C-alpha cells in the first residue's frame, strides 16, 4: 500500500507496455470504503497513503523530518513509542524557546 | 565529407566540453598546468590543486575522436575554457594518444592561438571567441547530461527528436563543480544511468546510442 511497481513505469520496455500502463493509470479506482465496519472487508490493501504524502508536505520542521523518515529507505525497526509519547504545545514551546 | 560550422542545416551531433580545466604557465618557456607534474606551484598560484586536470580532457577527447560516429563524420567538438576561450575541434585530426605530446600541443596552441595543417588545405584546431551560439546551428537542441535529472533511454530520445533538429550535448568535464553552469544555454537536463558516471563513458554511451538510432 506504499508504492506499486505496476504503476511505476520502466524506461526499458515497449510501446505495448507504455500504452497498457496509460490505460491502467486511467482505469484505476481506489476501492477503499470507509463507512464499512467489517475490518477484514474494508479493502484497505488496495490504497495508498495520500495522507502521509501531505504529512510529507507538512509545515513544521520536526514533523516534516518525521515524514521524510518515512520516505527515506527503511533502515531500522525500533522507535520506543514510550519515548515518543509525552509531547504537546507547552513542552514544544519550552523546547523551542530554549492593512 | 567534412563538416564545418559553415554548414548549418543537416542533422548532426555537437559536443560541448564545458569549463574544461586547461591552464598554461611560463617557467624559460611554457609548461601546462598539470596537477601531478607540479602541485607546489599551484599552491603558490592559489588555484586549487584538484581542479586543474587536463588529462580528463584528454580522455574525453580520445573517446569522442575514436567513436565510430566520428568515422561516420557526424560530430564536432567545442571546448569552452573556464577563462572564456572557445576552441573548435575538427572531425578529421589524430590528436596524440600520449600525454607528453598532448600537453605540449596544448601549450603551443595556447600561444600560437590557431592550428592549421601543414597539409595547409583546411584547419585542424581553431581558437574562436565565445559565446557558442555564433557557431551553433539553427534547429539546435541543447541538453545537459546531468546526474539529478530523470534518466531517458538514448534510442527513444534520439528517435523522438526530429530530422533536421540537430543535437548539442553538454558535459562539464571537471572533476567537481555545481552543474548549473550551462542553464543560460541549454534547453534541458537529462540523466543516463543510476550511477555517478564519468564524462568519457557518458559521451561514449551517447554516441553509441546515436549510432544505434542512425544504424551506423
Amino acid at each position: 500500500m506504499l508504492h506499486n511497481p505496476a504503476f511505476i513505469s520502466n524506461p526499458f520496455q515497449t510501446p505495448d507496455q507504455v500504452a497498457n500502463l496509460k490505460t491502467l493509470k486511467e482505469n484505476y479506482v481506489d476501492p477503499f470504503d470507509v463507512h464499512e465496519s467489517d475490518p477484514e472487508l474494508t479493502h484497505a490493501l488496495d490504497s495508498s497513503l495520500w495522507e502521509l504524502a501531505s504529512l510529507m508536505e507538512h509545515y513544521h520542521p520536526n514533523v516534516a523530518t518525521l515524514a521524510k523518515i518515512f520516505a527515506q529507505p527503511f533502515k531500522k525497526l525500533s522507535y520506543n513509542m514510550e519515548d515518543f509519547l509525552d509531547w504537546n504545545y507547552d513542552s514544544l514551546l519550552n523546547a523551542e524557546s530554549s492593512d | 565529407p567534412v563538416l564545418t560550422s559553415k554548414d548549418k542545416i543537416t542533422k548532426r551531433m555537437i559536443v560541448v566540453l564545458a569549463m574544461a580545466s586547461l591552464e598554461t604557465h611560463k617557467i624559460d618557456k611554457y609548461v601546462l598546468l598539470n596537477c601531478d607534474d607540479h602541485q607546489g606551484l599551484l599552491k603558490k598560484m592559489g588555484r586549487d590543486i584538484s581542479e586543474a586536470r587536463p588529462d580528463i580532457t584528454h580522455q574525453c577527447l580520445l573517446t569522442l575522436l575514436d567513436s565510430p560516429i566520428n568515422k561516420a563524420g557526424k560530430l564536432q567538438v567545442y571546448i569552452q575554457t573556464s577563462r572564456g576561450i572557445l576552441i573548435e575541434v575538427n572531425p578529421t585530426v589524430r590528436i596524440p594518444r600520449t600525454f607528453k605530446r598532448f600537453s605540449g600541443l596544448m601549450v603551443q596552441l595556447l600561444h600560437k592561438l590557431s592550428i592549421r595543417s601543414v597539409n595547409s588545405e583546411e584547419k585542424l584546431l581553431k581558437v574562436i571567441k565565445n559565446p557558442i551560439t555564433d557557431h551553433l546551428p539553427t534547429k539546435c537542441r541543447k541538453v545537459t547530461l546531468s546526474f539529478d535529472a530523470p534518466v531517458i533511454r538514448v534510442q527513444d530520445y534520439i528517435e523522438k527528436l526530429d530530422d533536421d533538429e540537430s543535437i548539442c550535448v553538454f558535459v562539464g568535464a571537471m572533476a567537481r563543480g555545481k552543474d548549473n553552469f550551462a542553464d543560460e544555454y541549454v534547453d534541458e537536463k537529462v540523466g543516463l544511468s543510476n550511477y555517478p558516471l564519468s564524462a568519457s563513458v557518458a559521451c561514449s554511451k551517447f554516441c553509441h546510442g546515436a549510432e544505434d538510432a542512425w544504424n551506423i
Binding site: 500500500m1 506504499l2 508504492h3 506499486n4 504503476f7 511505476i8 493509470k25 484505476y28 481506489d30 490504497s47 495508498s48 497513503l49 495520500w50 495522507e51 502521509l52 504524502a53 501531505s54 508536505e57 507538512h58 509545515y59 518515512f70 520516505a71 529507505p73 527503511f74 492593512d99 | 543510476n194 550511477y195 555517478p196
Partner: protein, 185 residues
C-alpha cells in the same frame, strides 16, 4: 505554501456550527449547538462582507444579528476558496481532503439553494476533481547503490636499524669464519 490540518478541522467544525441550529456528521464534536442561521437570509451583494475593521466587531460581537453571522460566514467562504486555490488544489491528498468539505457545502445548497458563491465553490470543486488524476503513491523507489571501491597502496626507525645491524653482524661473522677456515687449512 504549506499545509495545516487544523485549518481543515476548523472548517469542519465551524460549518457544522452554522448548520446545526449531527447524524450525517457525528465525527465532529461541536460546541454550542444553538446559534445557527434560520431561513431568513436576503443574500444580496449589499450585505456586510468581511469588513476587516476589528475591535468594533470584536468587543461588541455578543449582541448577534443575522447580519454579522452572515458576514463571518462569507468571510469563511472567501478564506476557504482562497487557500483552496493557494494550496489545497496542489496537495496530493486533495481528494479525501475535500470530500467532507464538499459534503458541507452541498448540505448548504440542499438547505437553501440560494447562494452563488458556495454554488461556484461546488462547481470549481467538481472541475478540480474531474481534472486531477489521483494515482497511488510511489514513495519507495531508490537508485541501485554501487560497489564499494578502494584505493591502492604503493610508493619504526630504531627497530629497523637494529635489523640492519643484525644482518651486518651475521654477514661479518660468517665471512670471517670462512676466512679463518681457509687460512688454517
Amino acid at each position: 505554501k504549506r499545509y495545516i490540518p487544523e485549518v481543515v478541522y476548523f472548517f469542519q467544525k465551524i460549518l457544522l456550527t452554522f448548520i446545526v441550529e449531527p447524524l450525517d456528521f457525528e465525527n465532529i464534536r461541536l460546541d454550542s449547538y444553538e446559534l445557527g442561521l434560520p431561513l431568513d437570509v436576503d443574500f444580496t451583494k449589499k450585505r456586510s462582507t468581511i469588513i476587516p475593521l476589528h475591535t468594533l466587531s470584536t468587543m461588541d460581537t455578543e449582541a448577534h444579528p443575522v447580519d454579522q453571522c452572515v458576514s463571518v460566514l462569507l468571510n469563511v467562504m472567501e478564506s476557504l476558496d482562497a487557500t483552496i486555490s493557494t494550496v489545497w488544489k496542489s496537495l496530493p491528498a486533495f481528494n479525501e481532503i475535500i470530500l467532507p468539505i464538499q459534503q458541507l457545502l452541498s448540505a448548504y445548497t440542499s438547505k437553501y439553494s440560494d447562494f452563488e458563491k458556495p454554488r461556484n465553490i461546488l462547481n470549481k470543486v467538481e472541475k478540480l476533481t474531474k481534472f486531477t488524476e489521483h494515482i497511488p503513491l510511489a514513495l519507495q523507489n531508490h537508485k541501485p547503490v554501487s560497489i564499494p571501491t578502494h584505493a591502492p597502496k604503493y610508493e619504526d626507525r630504531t627497530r629497523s636499524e637494529i635489523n640492519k645491524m643484525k644482518a651486518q653482524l651475521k654477514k661479518e661473522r660468517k665471512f670471517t669464519m670462512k676466512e679463518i677456515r681457509k687460512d688454517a687449512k
